[PDB]
Amino acid sequence: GNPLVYLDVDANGKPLGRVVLELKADVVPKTAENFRALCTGEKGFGYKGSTFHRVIPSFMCQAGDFTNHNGTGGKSIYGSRFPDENFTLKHVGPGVLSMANAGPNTNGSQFFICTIKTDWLDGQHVVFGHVIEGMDVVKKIESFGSKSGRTSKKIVITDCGQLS
Numbered sequence: 001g002n003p004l005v006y007l008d009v010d011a012n013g014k015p016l017g018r019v020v021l022e023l024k025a026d027v028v029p030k031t032a033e034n035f036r037a038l039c040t041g042e043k044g045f046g047y048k049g050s051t052f053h054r055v056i057p058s059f060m061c062q063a064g065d066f067t068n069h070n071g072t073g074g075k076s077i078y079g080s081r082f083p084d085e086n087f088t089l090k091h092v093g094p095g096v097l098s099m100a101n102a103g104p105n106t107n108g109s110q111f112f113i114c115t116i117k118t119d120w121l122d123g124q125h126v127v128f129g130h131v132i133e134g135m136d137v138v139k140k141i142e143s144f145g146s147k148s149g150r151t152s153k154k155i156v157i158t159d160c161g162q163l164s
């Protein structure tokens with residue numbers, strides 16, 4: 001069974017609500033497991049307390065750099081980077097959960113949730129899940145972004161974890 005995990009997100013300390021994500025461990029077990037474990041914090045580090053640092057309306061919301069908080073950092077539960085597992089899942093529309101990277105085989109912890117079909121990323125970013133509920137919360141996050149990616153409020157993952 002695929003994990004169900006959640007992100008509780010605030011904007012300047014004000015709750016926006018909860019995003020619930022299905023992780024496709026049945027297709028990309030290593031990538032799903034990394035994200036699941038970073039939600040629970042069970043390795044001693046993870047997403048709790050970190051930010052959505054790059055948010056671009058009509059594109060995507062990017063988070064997961066819990067070390068440098070600016071797109072340069074993050075790390076996986078395996079090491080500083082891990083290979084692209086596969087590209088079987090595609091960026092088919094809004095709600096897709098996919099790995100940010102810095103080129104081939106540079107997955108760490110940064111990730112993005114799409115607010116549009118980002119099919120030009122197929123074959124280059126590992127898709128590993130989708131939004132089950134809370135896409136309205138993703139839209140609220142999106143509303144505090146801008147074309148440069150700079151956010152107009154501090155968007156924080158106040159809490160995260162696993163539901164099943």
Ligand SMILES: O[C@@H]1CO[C@@H]2C[C@H]1Nc1ccccc12
Nearest residue numbers: 073080081100101102106108
């Ligand atoms: O080691 C890799 C590559 O450098 C950082 C940290 C980690 N993942 C990642 C993903 C997107 C952007 C930058 C990075």
